[PDB]
């Protein structure tokens, strides 16, 4: 039973957004060292971690569109190219492709996944 090396979507604050990353160390006492794809590394409790990779189809997520503003969308497909995962997010009837780090969950969107993928 080891979570080290598994891809997750986690929040680094109790009321923040969920970002994609990986578990690096088992700090113990329900705590995990998590390295986010953005380079941020910190300890995170299991209740703040979603063990799901990729984000399931039809999930509502928050995506960075046009590299300026975030907005809500729905996952409609996945695709990997040269090791990089791309999400097909539909926003108001229009689909686009987003990098992995451009796809996050709001506190409400992620909390709705805790019972299916949560670590606590």
């Amino acid at each position: 039973n080891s979570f080290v090396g598994l891809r997750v979507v986690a929040k680094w604050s109790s009321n923040g957004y969920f970002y994609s990353g990986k578990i690096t160390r088992d700090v113990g006492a329900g705590k995990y060292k998590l390295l986010f794809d953005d380079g941020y590394e910190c300890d995170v409790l299991g209740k703040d971690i979603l063990l799901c990779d990729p984000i399931p189809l039809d999930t509502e997520v928050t995506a960075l569109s046009e590299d300026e503003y975030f907005s809500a969308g729905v996952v409609k497909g996945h695709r990997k190219e040269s090791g990089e995962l791309y999400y097909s997010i539909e926003k108001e009837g229009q689909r686009k492709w987003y990098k992995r780090m451009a796809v996050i969950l709001s506190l409400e969107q992620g909390n709705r996944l805790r019972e299916q993928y949560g670590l606590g």
């Binding site: 380079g39 941020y40 590394e41 975030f70």
Partner: protein
């Protein structure tokens, strides 16, 4: 009091290129003046009205590919205040801002003389960013009036950059400018004022 998650400087410098860095300065000075000749002001702090209609501190986003955090701050201060240079000795803290974007906010703070603080206000009206990104400087009133709203509570009820409002209250506490008991009191009165004003409309 709203609080952002702190991060050490060296660990912020390890954040990946997907993070944006912002540097802002809290300039303040002891003020022996008395409003109406009966209300001591104690300290004056400088904030500004931004292009987007929100209050915040001087500064902005910095490029740190090939420059330090201080060099980037001084660039955005030279455009926004036209004032003199700050150094690494003025660095106070770094915070991870509320999402969704990945931003780490560095806060600097220096106590000037009241004369030097006014000279910053004079230079700011002559700066390139005046009228464009910066729509004016405002002094923060740290006093409260007999009605218990006038002054600092009313000021906190304005619209802020969320990061700046957290930085203001965090700095006033750790710089020993306002007792933490007085900050929670003022912030509570401000919220109450916001409640009533919104209940009506």
């Amino acid at each position: 009091v709203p609080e952002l998650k702190q991060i050490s400087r060296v660990e912020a410098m390890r954040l990946g290129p997907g993070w944006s860095h912002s540097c802002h300065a809290m300039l303040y000075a002891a003020n022996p003046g008395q409003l109406f000749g009966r209300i001591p002001m104690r300290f004056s702090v400088l904030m500004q009205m931004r292009f987007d209609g929100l209050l915040g501190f001087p500064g902005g986003f910095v490029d740190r590919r090939f420059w330090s955090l201080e060099d980037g701050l001084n660039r955005v201060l030279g455009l926004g205040l036209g004032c003199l240079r700050l150094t690494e000795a003025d660095y106070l803290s770094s915070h991870l801002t509320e999402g969704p974007h990945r931003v780490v906010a560095h806060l600097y703070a220096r106590q000037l003389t009241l004369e030097q603080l006014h000279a910053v206000e004079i230079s700011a009206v002559h700066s390139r960013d005046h009228g464009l990104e910066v729509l004016g400087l405002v002094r923060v009133p740290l006093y409260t009036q007999k009605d218990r709203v006038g002054g600092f509570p009313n000021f906190l009820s304005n619209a802020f950059v969320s990061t700046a409002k957290c930085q203001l209250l965090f700095a006033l506490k750790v710089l020993n400018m306002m007792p933490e008991e007085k900050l929670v009191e003022a912030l509570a009165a401000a919220t109450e004022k916001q409640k009533k004003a919104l209940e009506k409309l």
